[PDB]
Ligand binder design. Structure first.
Ligand SMILES: OC[C@@H](O)[C@H](O)[C@@H](O)CO
Lengths: 733, 121
């Protein structure tokens, strides 16, 4: 059969597939046979036919779409024979791709891990570029129909040219169509996780879980780190106790009972797995694995780690994990730090995440793993696990940027160790700022090193820090409805929960100049504080870009007239999070109560414009509509759910059942936030002279005209104090 | 008896803790001294072998040395030491650097003001 889809062009030894007007597959084959199989990266090349034009001559071909000219001059792919011009003017002369060459503009993607990183590390390129094109090489192995490694591609060069311009959201959508959508997360993954590299007993671990309840901190996940298994008692002839599959019965004399007690507390349970030293002769499962793999047990022959080997994988899932799953382990923390070597040339991290994520689905519907990034397409195996960050202001300052930038390669479920993993320095404010970021990150998992000094328990800290941490951990559970809805949107529509500003505001230069600022779902904009407070102000700060429109602090209702770039100041207990006029945010009214789905939703409405919110749940869709001051709630299915409505400052309706409409036009649109209260608070906490406090309070109270209030603060000899006062006068204008 | 051949490789267990590893395309292995090596006469030692169709394992009191056949690559030739001095730096891979080397020396201190890099010992 000579039949070919109309989107396929062949010329010399190349094949071009025009998958969209802005996405061209580029293949080279010595043999004239081109690759149809799935690869590690690509799952789907079925794209609806698109319009394009060809200029084919003897010696050259040009493929022309709405956004790109692709040229091929025959022969081997070199920087001279294969190149493209984009039909954009985002740069004066960075509008040409050359095969095998780097161009500027790439907005970056992510990397394997933050292991041993103190602050910034280099990132790999993503598919997003300010100049409108990027090339995603497919260097992976081909897969069989059922998803096992098949060997080398017959397309010895296989590339994807993205030429979406600054339509970043559409580039990511089409990347997901190509590599497969992110699977749905389960709701439990979006709550708080407790983890610590600490040799807990059953007793001490349950006592901690019960103290979390006593302290009014909700948790969804109980992580148990490597001290669950034998460590120091492993005979040295076998190597270290890092890898283990055998319970420490001194700490866990009845593992199934312990896991059942965590299940009764509605916690999902994961164990640390260090797979690299395989199954050695001292292990509980060794007799059964040695039988299956026909090992020499009198010579203590180990079942060495080999995820290329179908029999090893089968032994690993059925005979090593299987018994631990039967005891009640819900999902696996794959903790691989042992390199990228295999006989197949496939990264063992890729093999682990691919096969473990598939195996997890027998255990539970929409199950997860926790593992490091395994390259483009590995978003199919959530969750991401960033690993052994250094505990530092510099590490925190990198992390929001790292997180939002990862959306540029579709890896949208990074779980960082909140408060940082190891080394570095103690600073309770650092631990608190890091938790603020974690709550507004894809996953909020508390974790720490083996130190006796790095517990992330709120009560480790003083009464102020402890209370603020408890408040933020409660907030995480309030946000689960919003997070779970955004999760179902990632899985169904290919939209990241965390977006860089330039996704919404691609033509605004300031959207590229606030590296740690992001959109958090569709209704909230976050600007985490990631530097130690100024002790004179007793407040930290971040420069915020406010896009055009009216914005409100999500917590205080402090207003801000966009478009402006404004330095904003917050006490260590407060975080900069903002909503536009018209925003509607659902909150669980009962974040401490372990309900499978919330019995009551708070609808938090920001007055001053129309808005809309769709709450996706396991078995329902709930639409909130705010049009000409009328707030309406409707659902796909009937339910007993109670709805609370908070319109700006004020609870209007409490615990109303069913679908309803309510006219909010006759209700107070204004937040209580006011200039005079906020000014008094900022002056009162500041470690400045009382004479300065007195004069600033007197003059700003006395001076009526806003421009002369600003002139007065402009004379202040403390420059950061001027900025803080300016923020208040700007919100109060 | 201290000598084992497998595929295109020759292993010589000189001590319980010292193993020569040779590759030869032709199956001819080198007996002559080199600039570095002057003597390969060492007393017999005890060690075990697990030889299969496609793989060999040599086991001493201190090391597992594995060879999976073919040219020597990081994947085909590697070893686990029977020690627990590190949590996961106990594996040698052919042609890869691992941590822990306490260093050796270098040709000269010509033009060196303070420290210079040393070669591995
Ligand atoms: O299992 C011990 C490890 O050091 C873990 O605590 C880290 O989180 C792994 O990255």
């Amino acid at each position: 059969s000579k039949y070919m889809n109309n989107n396929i062009i062949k010329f010399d030894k190349a094949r071009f597939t025009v998958l969209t007007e802005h996405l061209i597959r580029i293949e080279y084959s010595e043999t004239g046979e081109f690759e149809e199989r799935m690869t590690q990266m690509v799952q789907n090349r079925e794209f609806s036919e698109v319009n394009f034009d060809i200029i084919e001559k003897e010696e050259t071909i040009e493929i022309i779409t709405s956004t790109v000219h692709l040229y091929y001059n025959g022969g081997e792919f070199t920087n001279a024979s294969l190149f493209a011009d984009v039909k954009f003017n985002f740069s004066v002369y960075s509008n040409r791709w050359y095969f095998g060459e780097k161009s500027d503009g790439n907005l970056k993607g992510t990397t394997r891990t933050l292991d041993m990183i103190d602050g910034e590390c280099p990132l790999e390129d993503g598919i997003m570029s300010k100049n409108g094109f990027a090339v995603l090489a497919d260097k992976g192995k081909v897969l069989t129909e059922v998803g096992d490694i098949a060997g080398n591609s017959v397309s010895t060069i296989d590339l994807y040219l993205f030429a979406y311009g600054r339509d970043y959201r559409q580039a990511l959508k089409d990347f997901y169509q190509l590599t497969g959508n992110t699977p749905k997360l389960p709701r439990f993954a979006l709550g708080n996780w407790w983890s610590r590299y600490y040799d807990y007993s059953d007793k001490s671990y349950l006592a901690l879980m019960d103290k979390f309840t006593d302290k009014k901190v909700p948790l969804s996940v109980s992580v148990i780190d490597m001290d669950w298994h034998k460590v120091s008692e492993v005979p040295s002839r076998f190597g270290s106790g890092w890898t283990g599959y055998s319970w420490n019965k001194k700490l866990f004399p009845n593992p199934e009972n312990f896991i059942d007690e965590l299940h009764q507390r509605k916690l999902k349970v994961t164990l640390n797995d260090h797979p690299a030293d395989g199954i050695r002769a001292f292990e509980d499962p060794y007799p059964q694995v040695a039988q299956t793999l026909d090992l020499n047990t009198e010579l203590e022959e180990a079942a060495k780690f080999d995820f290329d080997n179908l029999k090893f994988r089968k032994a690993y899932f059925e005979e090593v994990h299987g018994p631990l799953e039967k005891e009640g382990v819900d999902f696996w923390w794959i903790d691989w730090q042992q390199g990228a070597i295999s006989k197949s040339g496939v990264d063992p991290l890729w093999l682990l995440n691919h096969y473990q994520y598939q195996n997890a689905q027998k255990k539970h519907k929409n199950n997860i793993i926790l593992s490091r990034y395994a390259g483009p397409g590995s978003h199919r195996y959530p969750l991401g696990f960033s690993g052994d960050s250094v505990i530092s202001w510099a590490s925190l300052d990198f992390q929001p940027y790292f997180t939002s930038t990862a959306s540029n390669i579709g890896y949208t479920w990074w779980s960082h160790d909140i408060g940082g993993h190891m080394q570095g320095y103690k600073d309770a404010e650092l631990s608190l700022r890091w938790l603020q970021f974690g709550v507004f990150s894809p996953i909020n998992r508390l974790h720490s090193s083996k130190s006796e000094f790095t517990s992330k328990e709120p009560w480790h800290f003083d009464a102020v820090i402890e209370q603020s941490m408890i408040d933020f951990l409660q907030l995480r559970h309030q946000l689960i409805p919003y997070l779970y809805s955004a999760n179902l949107i990632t899985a169904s529509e290919g939209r990241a929960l965390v977006e860089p500003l330039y996704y919404e505001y691609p033509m605004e230069e300031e959207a590229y100049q606030h590296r740690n600022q992001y959109l958090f779902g569709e209704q909230l904009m976050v600007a985490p504080i990631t530097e130690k407070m100024n002790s004179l102000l007793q407040m930290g700060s971040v420069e915020v870009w406010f896009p055009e429109g009216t914005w409100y602090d999500f917590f205080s209702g402090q207003p801000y007239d966009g478009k402006v770039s404004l330095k904003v100041y917050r006490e260590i207990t407060e975080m900069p999070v903002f909503a536009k006029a018209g925003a509607i945010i659902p909150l669980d009214k009962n974040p401490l109560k372990k309900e499978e789905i919330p019995s009551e939703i708070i609808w938090k409405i920001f007055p001053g414009a129309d808005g809309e919110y769709l709450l996706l749940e396991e078995d329902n869709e709930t639409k909130a509509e705010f049009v000409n001051g009328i707030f309406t709630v409707t659902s796909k299915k009937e339910s007993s759910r109670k709805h609370t409505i908070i319109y700006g400052e004020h609870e209007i309706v409490s615990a109303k059942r069913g679908e309803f409409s309510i006219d909010l036009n006759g209700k107070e649109e204004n937040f209580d936030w006011n200039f005079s209260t906020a000014l008094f608070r900022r002056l009162d906490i500041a470690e400045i002279s009382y004479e300065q406090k007195d004069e600033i309070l007197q003059q700003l109270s006395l001076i009526e005209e806003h421009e002369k209030q600003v002139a007065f603060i402009k004379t202040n000899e403390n420059q950061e104090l001027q900025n803080s006062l300016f923020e208040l006068l700007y919100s109060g204008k």
